[PDB]
Structures are given as structure tokens and as C-alpha cells.
């Protein structure tokens, strides 16, 4: 029960560790050893979702049987059968999708252009996405 | 029964410990050894939620059988059958989701800008989220 | 359960590693050792989708049986049967399709034409596709 | 489950390797050793599609039984049966079809005619096809 | 599953190898060693198609039974049976048909007539067919 | 499955080899050693076709039973039975029929009459047939 849950926790940590390497592999040759520091956080969910969809197309009907009666003298009778396009889809979702991620970078003292360029580099280095509400902050402060 | 519950408690502590490392890895090189102190708290729940949804689309009907009678002289009769889009979803929730989290940081004596910058760094260092009603306080006081 | 999921994670890393070789095999002879740095990221999904389609062609009907009555004096009666073209398709999707990919390249200090040419080379070196919302950034910054 | 999927990945790499030989066998004697560089990418899918078609020909009917009544005095009655041409087709698709392919070639420094001729040679050397949205770029840049 | 698929790949390579010999057996005695280079590509499919056709001839009917009534005074009645020509065909397609093929030939430096003659020779040497959208390019470029 | 298919490939090669001997047995004593070169290609199919035909002769009917009534006063009634000629044919097609064939011959340097005569000889030497869209080209070029 709770034995497996702890394992899940460890997995999250692993993800963070991976990120903590990648940012280390890019900022080190450009900024320098001891002139930067950063940390990351990854939050995920472990739900279990299944979906079954069964759709129809009402705009394309096909007739199979038809009966009509038009007895004037005004008796009018009609009986028709139809066949429709059916689509069935069955989907199972993954377990462990990343929900949110936060990255913070502090640089020892910079102009606006340099910070913007470093942020642009980190955009591809990390993979920031605005759809998931991700967070990425880069700034320069005085060390001590 | 109660043997497993205690384990859950330990898990919470582990989470706090993790945070107590991350804040230590960022504030130490910028502020300095012995010039800061902080503690965290994490509160979670261990419920068990299952959901089953079965939705329909009323705006897209598809006809299958149709019978009509229009006997004037004004007898009018109609009988129709319909087919609708059906969606079935089954979801199971996780056990151990984080509900609230509190972070407090005290700095030995600072200007407003420095405190704001440190708070901004901690925002990404911790992962503060306003949706869950999280709490983060950073301030400077005189030590003794 | 969770034992296999971790394996999936490793697979993603492998993909990134492959890319980290290819960019190394092209930029090295043109730019030079120690004058560039780059990192990549690949995000995928592990869903399980099955589809079953059953289509009809309403514009091409074929008659099988026909009965008519035209008793004037105005009794009119008709009864027809039809046969239609039926197409049945069953599809199963893959597991592990690439969703998004980000590439970032920084070059030590360049004119606009050189950067454009390097980007064009990397376009075929990596395989950037705008349909998936892929990201590729190449820029030049001052190293330290 | 995931053990076989990795194998699929390896297969893709093999394809690329093959291409990386063919371009090496053509450009080497014409351009020269150390005056060119190139890389390729191949993306495929591993779906499983089955199709069953059952077509009819409505323009060519054949009568089998016919009954008629033409009682004047105007009773008119008709009843006919028909036989139609039926075609049944069952198809199974392959697994591992190539979807897209990208080729990029850089030549150390050229006139437009020479680049056009090299592109024309590579057209048959690789097998570029516009139907699949393939990509082939050849250009000349200054090396370092 | 995937073990046999790889074998299919090898088969394709074999085809190319065969072509790479035939062009070598014709161009070598006429052009000379070291004055030409060429490569080929063959793309095939591995589907599985089955067909069943059941055709009729409506223009040639044969009567079997006939009943008529011609009671004047105007009662007219007729009932006829027919026999028709039936043809049944069952076909199974091959696996591994060649879809497209590309040939590219470069000759070290030529007049238009010589290139046209070499192309004409290669037409029969390879078997170029316009129905399948085959590609054959022969040109002369300056070597280095 | 695929083991036998490869064998089929080998068979095709054998056919070509046979042709490569026959042209060698005719052109050698008339043209001379080292004054000619040629190659052939044979493309076949490996389908499986079965046919069943069931034909009738409507122009030759034979009466078996006949009933007539001619009650004047104008009641007219007739009922006849017929017997027809039936032909049943069952056919099974071969596997490995030759579809197309290409022959190309180059002669070291000729007048039009000599080339026409050599083409006429090769017509019977090979067996060129225009029904299958066969290809045969004979020409003279300068060797090197």
C-alpha cells in the first residue's frame, strides 16, 4: 500500500536531479565556476484515467429501406430506415505526467540584454512551457 | 490498522527534510553561514476518491428510424428514434497529495529591494503556489 | 507497476543523448572545439489509443428489390431495398510518440547571415518541425 | 512490453546509418576528404491498420425474376429482383513505414550552378520525395 | 514480431546491391575506371491484399420458365424467370512489390548527344518505367 | 514467410543470366570480342488467380413441356418450360509470368542498315514482343 507510494516520491527527486545536471552543463562554461546557483522543482500526479468515446455523424445518412404511400383523391405515409457512421475509441492515460515546474537562477554581479540572452538560452536548456503554468526566474544579486 | 498510519507520518517528515536541504543549498552561498535560519511545514491528506462520469451530447442527434403520417381532409403523427454520443470516464485519485505548505525565513541584520529579490529567488527555489493557499514569509530581525 | 515506468524515463534520456551526439558531429568541424555549447530536451507520451471506424457511402445506392403500384382511376405505392458500400477500419496507435522538442545553441563571439546559415544547417541536422510546436534557438553570447 | 519498443528505436538508427554511408560514397570522390559534412534523420510510425472494403456497381443491374400486371379498362403492378456485382477486399498495412526524412549538407568554401548540380545528384542519391514533405538542404559556409 | 521486419530491410539493400553491379558492368568499359560514380535507391511495400470479384452479364439473358395471360374482352399478365452468366475470381497479391526507384549518375568532364546516348543505354540497363514515377538523372560535373 | 520470397528473387536473376548467355552466343562471332556490351532486366509477378465461368446460350432454346389454352367466344393462356446449353469452366493461373523485359546493346564505332540488321537478328535472338510493352534498344557509341 504505502510501500510503493514512497517509491513514487523518489522518482520525482530523480527528475529534479536530471535538471540540476543540464543547467550545470550550460551555465558553467559561459558564466564560470562559483558565479551562479540554481534549484528546480517538479510536481506530478499519479491518477488513473480511462476514456471510451462513441461518436456519430448526423450529416451523412444512408438509407436502407423505404416505404411510401401517396393516396390522393390526401393520405401520405412514409417509413424509412437509416445507417450511420460509428466511431469507437478507447484510451488509457499515463501515470506520472509532469504538472508544474519551477526554475530559479541567481547570478553574481548585469545589463538587461545579457539577462535576456541567458533566459533565452535557459528556455531551450530546460523546456519552459506556458501551457502548464511553468515558472522560470533569472536574476542577478550581490553575493556575500 | 494503526501500524501503517504511523508510517504515513514519517513520510510527511521526509518531505520537510527535502525542503530543508533545498533552501540550504541556495541561501548558503549568497547570505553566508550563520546569518539565516528557516523551517518548513507540509500538511497532506490520505483520502481515497473514485469517480465515474457518463456524459451525453444533446446538440448532435442522429436519427435511426422515422415514421410519419400526414392525413389531411388534419391528422398528424410522428415517431422518431435517436442515437447520441456517449462518453464514459473512470478516474482514481492519488493518496498523499500536498494540501498546504508554510515557509518562514529570518535574516540577520536590509533594504526592501534585497528582501524582494531573496523572496523572488525562494519563489522558484520552493515552488510557492497561491492556488493551494501556500504561505511564504521572509523577514529580517536582530539576532542575539 | 512503477518498476516499468522508471524504464520509460530512461528511454527518454537515451533519445536526448542521441541528439547530443548529432549536433556534436556537425558543429565541431565548422565552429571548433570549445566555441559552442548546446542541450536538448524531448517530451513524449505513453497513452494507448484504439480506433474502429465503420463508414458508408450514401451517394452510391444499389437497388436489390423493388415493388410498385400505380392504380389510377390515384393510389401510388412503392417499396425498395438498397445495398450500400461498407468500409471497416481497425487501428492501434504506437506508445512513445515524441510530442515536443527544444534545442538551444550558444556560440562564443557574429553577423546575421552566419547565424541564419547555422540555423539552416541545424534545421536538417535535428529535424525541426513546426507542426508539433518544436523549439529551436541559436544565438551568440560573450563567454567568460 | 517496453522491451520490444527499444528495439524499434535501434531500427531507426540503422536506417540513418545506411544513409550516412550512401552520401559518403558519392560526395567523397567529387568534393574531397574534409571539405564536407552531413547528417540525416528518419522518423517513422508503428501503427497497425486493417481495412475491409465491400463495393457495389449500381450502373450494371441484372434481372432475375419479373412479374407484371397491366389491367386496363388502369391497374399497373410490377415486381422485379436484381443481382449486382460484389467486390470484397481485405488489406493489412505494414509496420514501420517512413514518414519524414531530413538531409543537410554543408560544403567548405561556390557558384549557384555547382550547388544546383550537387543538389540534383543528391536527389537521386537519397531519394527525395515531395509527397511526404521531405526536407533536403545543401549550402556552403566558411569553416574554421 | 519485429525480428522478421528487420529481415525485410536487408532484402531491400540486396536489391540496391544488384543494381550497383549492373551499372558497373556497362559504364566501366565505355567511360573508364575512376571517371564516374552512381548510387541507387529502391523503396517497396509489404502489404497483404486479397480480392474476390463476382461479375454478371446483363446484356445476355436466358429464359427458363414463362407464363403469360392475354384475356381481352384487357387483362395482361406475365411472369418470367432468367438465368445469367456468373464469373467468380479470387486473387491474392504479392508481398514486396517495388514502388519507386531512383538512379543518379555523375560523369567527370560533355556534349548533349553523348549524355543522351548514355541515358538511352542506362534506360535499358536499369529498366526505367514512367508508370511508377521512377527517377533517373545523368549529368556531368567537375571533379576535385 | 519471408524465407521463400527471397528464393523468388534468385529465380528472376537466373532468367537474366540465361538471356546474358544467348546474346553472347550470337553477337560474339559477328561483332567480335571486346566490341560490344549489353545487359538485360526481367520483371515478373507472383499473384494467384482462379477463375470459374458458367456461360449460357440464349439463342438456342429447347422446349420440354408446353400447355396452351385458346378459348374464343378471347382467353389465351400459355405455359412453357425450356432447357438451355450450360458450359462450366474452371481455370487456375500460373505463378511467375514475365511482365516486362528490357534489353540494351551498345556497339563500339555504323550505318543505319547494319544497326537495323543487328536489331532484326536480336529480335529473334531475344523474343521481343510489343504486347507486353517490351523494350529493346541498340545503338553505337564511342568507347574510351
Residue numbers in the entry:
A (entry chain 2), B (entry chain 1), C (entry chain 3), D (entry chain 4), E (entry chain 5), F (entry chain 6): 255 to 327, 367 to 402, 418 to 452
Paper passage:
The C-ring is tightly attached to the MS-ring, which consists of ~34 FliF molecules with two transmembrane helices. FliF contains three ring-building motifs (RBM1, RBM2, and RBM3) and β-collar in the periplasmic region between the two transmembrane helices. Among these motifs, RBM3–β-collar forms an S-ring on the distal side of the cytoplasm within the MS-ring. We performed single-particle cryo-EM of the purified MS-ring formed by FliFG fusion proteins with the FliG-G214S mutation and determined the near-atomic resolution structure of the Vibrio S-ring.
A total of 228,461 particle images extracted from 5,962 cryo-EM micrographs were analyzed. They were separated into two classes in the 2D class averages, with them showing either 35- or 34-fold rotational symmetry on the S-ring. Because the MS-ring in the native flagellar motor is thought to comprise 34 FliF subunits, it is inferred that the 34-fold rotational symmetry structure reflects the native S-ring structure, whereas the 35-fold rotational symmetry structure is an artificial structure induced by the overexpression of FliFG fusion proteins alone. Consequently, we built the atomic model of the S-ring part (RBM3–β-collar) at 3.23 and 3.33 Å resolutions from the maps of both classes after C35 and C34 rotational symmetry corrections, respectively. The monomeric structures in the S-ring part from the 35- and 34-mer structures are almost identical (RMSD = 0.286 Å). Our S-ring structures are composed of 34 or 35 molecules of the FliFG fusion protein. Their diameters differ: the outer and inner diameters are about 26.0 nm and 9.6 nm, respectively, in the 35-mer ring, and about 25.2 nm and 9.4 nm, respectively, in the 34-mer ring. In our two S-ring structures, the 34-mer structure should reflect the native S-ring structure, since the in situ MS-ring is a 34-mer of FliF. We compared the Vibrio S-ring FliF 34-mer structure with three previously reported Salmonella S-ring FliF 34-mer structures where a notable difference is the tilt angle of the RBM3 domain. When measuring the α1 helix angle from the side-view of the ring, the RBM3 outer part is tilted downwards by 8° in the Vibrio S-ring, whereas it is tilted upwards by 6° or 8° or is nearly horizontal in the Salmonella S-ring. When comparing the β2/β5 sheet angles, they all exhibited a similar angle (55°) when viewed from the outside of the ring, whereas the angle is smallest in the Vibrio S-ring (58°) compared with the Salmonella S-ring (64°–68°) when viewed from the side. When focusing on the subunit interface of the RBM3 during ring formation, interaction was facilitated by two sites: an electrostatic interaction between E270 and K276 and a hydrophobic interaction between A399, V429, and L447 in the Vibrio S-ring.
